[PDB]
């Protein structure tokens, strides 16, 4: 069945069901839609069985037929046969209810700058679907993996523009995929498929298929007797999970008392980012301003990104993050397309909350290295130029859907002035490392299940622990923590006041109390 | 008995018929070109033309289907499976007054569209000469047959053709067109 996938089934179901849906409207009303999309990412168990479940969910002749199987030796053979191929797609839309549908046409499909044929090929095929646009009822379902293997100039308007991507492996699709797969072969009946889950992270589900394969292959080869009812073990599903590695590739919430100190940054971000979307009609009858990019700082080390998660949290509203490692992929180019996707679906899930972690790695030096730093501008310049893309409407019934980005570093200099300038962001708050009090609250809330007794008193701590981080208390304590339990041993459930003393002196924090002093002035300059 | 199925050799393999050794046809004692129901062992019947074997030997069964069941069709070569003699019948064949079919075509590529039907209706009244047929079967037609048909579910039959009948050259073909029972 549908693995881990029917959310994608169903917007793709949609956007084609428009047109085929409705077909006797478009002439009606000269309304031509696109006719032609691009199913992008790792096939197997997923895209063509997904292709399958939707032309049934409608009913359409799953011309199923895989376009590198229909290569040629001597030109004119090949488009000859995309002439036939097309020609059985065109006599079907003199039919009823019906779809083509091809897969892995990348072979078919190489990129611009190549030799000759390519352009042959391509042309041929663009005149087959430009002849289409007059067909009934059919469209062309480009089945790739990645949508940069194909050739450019096929994904023009007018042309291979809807362009979609597979599901990515979230957990809950893990498991749903795991039991589709399982659904037609014994495995025990004691499995946490979830554990395996997320066990997979970057696996994609015919991964999983490959994954559970082998272990029911060394599952045959290990049982002796009963080799007709294979009770499939865990234990060699951890075995194949040794035998294998996946490919290239913030659900977690969080809550507020999660987190202390700097309640004014707290109540700042309440003001003027969830209050909006959780008071807009009264914004709008207050009309005040909507301030559209915000941006937050202090010293590095205070886990920021989980004041971030916790805004994240306490709205609801479909937050996404974008990092570094996130986005330093070996492609060059791909960085500015990326962060093209990321506000797409942000204006897609339009009431949405975007959030650009360690701007500092997403954008490094200036000008550093005075020659090589050609393309990080360019990711600054389509940047700039998505930014006042969220120029919105409806000046003084009050729906205004836009996407109030806040971004955070500690790096002021390594930035591009012209994204602080009030024309993209216009509110710019600090984060200083906490006070005494803030770090008496910090300690306590992260104490709250350590393993406490009698003995303890944060108050000491508090006075010892100035110039620390956040991150200090709590690896201070954590190691504490383990000092405590080695010395008495497993069995043992005391506590101390002293190892974390002697922690302490282990563990050296950023006691300059000079470098916050740089930061603070330096971003105070640059607002 | 029992008998063993080669495979066919190419002459026979153009027509219909299946050839058999005079023990066989001294059992069910057909006189020659008769119509015998063959039940395959893999589901679905078959029908085919009865001619002795070339040098008098014996419990041998070459056959060609032509005359299928629905989809049946190749599970009649590829084998060294046996068949008894019970599985074979000799069936009656009336001269089936008229007849009605629903054609595939052959994928003239290029060209479809209100099909010319005198065209098809002359080729598939000749691929239908004088062979026995018997309802609910497919009919294939030989390769590099002329013209355009390449199939004729059997469908319609005049004075009931359930066990086989024999098209004549006198028989009217309505080119019905129910495609039936598609699943």
Redo the contacts between chains.
């Keep these: 069945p549908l693995g881990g996938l029917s959310e994608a089934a169903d917007s793709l179901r949609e956007l084609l069901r428009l047109p085929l849906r409705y077909p006797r409207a478009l002439t009606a009303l000269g309304l031509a839609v696109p006719r032609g999309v691009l199913l992008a990412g790792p096939p197997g168990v997923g895209k063509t069985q997904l292709v399958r479940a939707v032309a049934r969910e409608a009913g359409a002749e799953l011309l199923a037929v895989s376009a590198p199987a229909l290569q040629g030796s001597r030109p004119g053979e090949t488009e000859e046969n995309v002439r036939?191929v097309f020609?059985?797609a065109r006599?079907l839309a003199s039919r009823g209810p019906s779809l083509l549908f091809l897969d892995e046409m990348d072979a078919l499909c190489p990129q611009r700058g190549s030799r000759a044929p390519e352009s042959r090929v391509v042309a041929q095929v663009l005149t087959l679907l430009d002849g289409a646009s007059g067909d009934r009822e059919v469209v062309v379902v480009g089945a790739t993996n990645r949508p940069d293997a194909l050739d450019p100039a096929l994904r023009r308007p007018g042309r291979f523009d809807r362009e979609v991507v597979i599901g990515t492996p979230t957990l809950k699709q893990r498991k749903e995929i795991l039991q589709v797969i399982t659904s037609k072969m014994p495995i025990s009946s004691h499995v946490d498929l979830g554990l395996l889950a997320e066990m997979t992270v970057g696996y994609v589900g015919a991964d999983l298929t490959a994954l559970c394969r082998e272990a029911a292959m060394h599952a045959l080869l290990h049982s002796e007797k009963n080799q007709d009812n294979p009770v499939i073990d865990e234990i060699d599903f951890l075995e194949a999970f040794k035998n294998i590695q996946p490919s290239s590739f913030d659900i977690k919430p969080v809550d507020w008392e999660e987190i202390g100190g700097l309640e004014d940054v707290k109540l700042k971000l309440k003001q003027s980012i969830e209050w909006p979307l959780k008071f807009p009609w009264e914004f709008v009858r207050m009309g005040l301003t909507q301030p559209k990019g915000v941006l937050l700082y202090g010293p590095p080390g205070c886990a920021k990104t989980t004041l971030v998660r916790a805004l994240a949290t306490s709205c609801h509203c479909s937050f996404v993050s974008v990092s570094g490692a996130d986005l330093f992929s070996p492609f060059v180019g791909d960085s500015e397309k990326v962060l093209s996707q990321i506000f797409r679906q942000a204006r897609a899930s339009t009431p949405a909350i975007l959030f650009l972690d360690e701007i500092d790695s997403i954008l490094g030096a200036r000008s550093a290295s005075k020659t090589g730093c050609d393309v990080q501008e360019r990711v600054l310049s389509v940047l700039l130029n998505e930014l006042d893309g969220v120029g919105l409407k409806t000046i003084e019934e009050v729906f205004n859907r836009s996407v109030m980005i806040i971004a955070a570093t500690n790096r002021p200099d390594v930035l591009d002035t012209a994204l602080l300038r009030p024309g993209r962001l216009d509110k710019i708050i600090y984060i200083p490392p906490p006070d005494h009090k803030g770090r008496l609250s910090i300690l306590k809330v992260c104490t709250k299940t350590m393993p406490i007794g009698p003995d303890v008193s944060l108050e000491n701590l508090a006075a010892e622990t100035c110039f620390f981080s956040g991150a200090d208390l709590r690896n201070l304590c954590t190691e504490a923590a383990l000092l405590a339990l080695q010395e008495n041993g497993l069995d043992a459930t005391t506590v101390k006041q002293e190892h974390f003393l002697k922690s302490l002196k282990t563990v050296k924090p950023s006691l300059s109390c000079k470098d916050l002093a740089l930061y603070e002035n330096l971003f105070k300059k640059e607002g | 008995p029992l008998l063993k199925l080669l495979p066919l050799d190419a002459r026979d393999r153009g027509t219909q018929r299946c050839r058999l050794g005079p023990a066989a046809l001294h059992a069910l004692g057909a006189r020659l070109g008769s119509a015998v129901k063959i039940s395959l062992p893999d589901g679905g019947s078959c029908l085919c033309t009865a001619w002795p074997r070339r040098d008098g030997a014996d419990g041998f069964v070459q056959l060609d289907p032509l005359c299928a069941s629905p989809g049946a069709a190749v599970g009649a070569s590829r084998s060294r499976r046996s068949l008894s003699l019970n599985r074979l019948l000799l069936v009656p064949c009336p001269p089936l007054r008229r007849v009605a079919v629903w054609p595939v075509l052959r994928e003239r590529?290029?060209a479809?569209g209100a099909r010319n039907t005198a065209a098809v209706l002359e080729a598939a009244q000749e691929l239908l000469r004088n062979r026995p047929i018997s309802l609910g079967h497919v009919v294939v037609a030989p390769p590099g047959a002329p013209g355009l048909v390449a199939a004729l579910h059997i469908v319609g039959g005049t004075p009931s053709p359930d066990p086989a009948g024999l098209v004549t050259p006198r028989t009217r073909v309505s080119l019905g067109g129910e495609p039936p029972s598609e699943a």
């Design positions: 036939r020609q059985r006599e | 590529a290029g479809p």
